[PDB]
Write an enzyme that holds these catalytic residues in place. Structure first.
Site, short mmCIF file in Angstrom:
data_model
loop_
_atom_site.label_atom_id
_atom_site.label_comp_id
_atom_site.label_asym_id
_atom_site.label_seq_id
_atom_site.Cartn_x
_atom_site.Cartn_y
_atom_site.Cartn_z
N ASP A 180 30.26 33.54 50.97
CA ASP A 180 31.21 33.27 52.08
C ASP A 180 31.54 31.78 52.11
O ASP A 180 32.71 31.45 52.37
CB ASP A 180 30.64 33.76 53.42
CG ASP A 180 31.06 35.17 53.80
OD1 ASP A 180 31.32 35.98 52.88
OD2 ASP A 180 31.20 35.42 55.02
N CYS A 214 42.41 36.41 44.99
CA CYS A 214 41.36 36.24 46.01
C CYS A 214 42.14 36.43 47.33
O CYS A 214 42.99 37.34 47.40
CB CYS A 214 40.64 34.92 45.72
SG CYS A 214 41.77 33.53 45.49
N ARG A 220 39.40 30.71 44.14
CA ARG A 220 38.56 31.45 43.20
C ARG A 220 39.41 31.92 42.00
O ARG A 220 38.87 31.94 40.88
CB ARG A 220 37.90 32.61 43.92
CG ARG A 220 37.02 32.18 45.07
CD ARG A 220 36.50 33.39 45.78
NE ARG A 220 36.01 33.04 47.08
CZ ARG A 220 35.62 33.91 48.03
NH1 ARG A 220 35.70 35.22 47.82
NH2 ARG A 220 35.15 33.44 49.18
N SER A 221 40.65 32.34 42.26
CA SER A 221 41.60 32.84 41.24
C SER A 221 41.84 31.73 40.21
O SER A 221 41.90 32.00 39.00
CB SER A 221 42.90 33.29 41.88
OG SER A 221 42.72 34.41 42.74
N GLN A 261 40.68 24.69 45.09
CA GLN A 261 40.92 24.30 46.51
C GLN A 261 39.96 23.18 46.94
O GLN A 261 40.32 22.41 47.82
CB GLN A 261 40.76 25.52 47.42
CG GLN A 261 42.03 26.33 47.58
CD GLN A 261 41.88 27.45 48.58
OE1 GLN A 261 41.19 28.43 48.35
NE2 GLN A 261 42.56 27.31 49.71
#
Ligand SMILES: O[C@H]1CN[C@H]2Cc3c([nH]c4ccccc34)[C@@H]1C2
Length: 281
Positions: A180, A214, A220-221, A261
């Site tokens: 998370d 994602c 994450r992608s 990110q």
């Protein structure tokens, strides 16, 4: 060599600094179609938009818009479609894009619920005997089989074009254990996951590009594509240490904004590539 540069940035704690140089240098292209008022409800996040030049177009005359980008890596001969987690109102568009682009795999790097909020619509069937029909795009989706492992699930799906009665098999690769907050402590299970997508044939030139998502399709992608492309270039090149991860990232950012990110995601990407390099052996 990136391993040395890794320990340099680490020992110096310069990750936020590198991450900001990348932010500053990143391409900025128009995203006019994404910002049209009629597309407001086709976007999960208002500050995450496909560039017009690289955006995937749906073949429906009405509204061709989906939040999805084609990332074309010319030297590596790899393409990827990066998209947001579908919304309740775009699940039909999502499967229409998979159909139209001849994709063989869907890579999902999020859970439907994280931090007590919905990051994604439930866009695939949970049981064999309860198939989904997308009336807006005239598609039927059936769960054929599901293989649940500790870190990921693989699902076989049949997608049927109700208009032409053609069917295709789609592979759903669902990485279920990204935490998370932050990033995995070790990249071992992420590399295992990536080798499994590769082994499936889903990233191969015979098929349309793989669909990766994602929640926003950038964090994450981003890490997924960056690691795959860097490792493939290290196989192809006379000198494997000519691969600069910062250059590859900036090339990918010409196609979709914001890929990677956080400085943690950047760090993790270096670690995934460094460790993946010493697997090939
Ligand atoms: O300890 C360093 C040794 N060389 C690389 C491998 C590596 C590091 N840290 C990690 C944490 C989890 C998994 C692998 C690593 C550093 C960079």
């Amino acid at each position: 060599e990136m391993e040395k540069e890794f320990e340099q940035i680490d020992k110096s704690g310069s990750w936020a600094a590198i991450y900001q140089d990348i932010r500053h240098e990143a391409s900025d292209f128009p995203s006019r179609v994404a910002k049209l008022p009629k597309n407001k409800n086709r976007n999960r996040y208002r500050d995450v938009s496909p560039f017009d030049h690289s955006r995937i177009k749906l073949h429906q005359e009405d509204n061709d818009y989906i939040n999805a980008s084609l990332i074309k890596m010319e030297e590596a001969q790899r393409s990827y479609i990066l998209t947001q987690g579908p919304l309740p109102n775009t699940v039909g568009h999502f499967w229409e894009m998979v159909w139209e682009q001849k994709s063989r795999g869907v890579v999902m790097l999020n859970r439907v619920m994280e931090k007590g909020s919905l990051k994604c619509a439930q866009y695939w069937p949970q049981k064999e005997e309860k198939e989904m029909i997308f009336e807006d795009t005239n598609l039927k989706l059936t769960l054929i089989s599901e293989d649940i492992k500790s870190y990921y699930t693989v699902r076989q799906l049949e997608l049927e074009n109700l208009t032409t009665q053609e069917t295709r098999e789609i592979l759903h690769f669902h990485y279920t254990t990204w935490p998370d907050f932050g990033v995995p402590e070790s990249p071992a299970s992420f590399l295992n996951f990536l080798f499994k997508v590769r082994e499936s044939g889903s990233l191969s030139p015979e098929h349309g590009p793989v669909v990766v998502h994602c929640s926003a399709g950038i964090g994450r992608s981003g890490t997924f594509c960056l690691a795959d492309t860097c490792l493939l270039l290290m196989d192809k090149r006379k000198d494997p240490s000519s691969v600069d991860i910062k250059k590859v990232l900036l090339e990918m950012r010409k196609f979709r904004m914001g890929l990677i990110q956080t400085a943690d995601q950047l760090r993790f990407s270096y670690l995934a590539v460094i460790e993946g390099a010493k697997f090939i052996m």
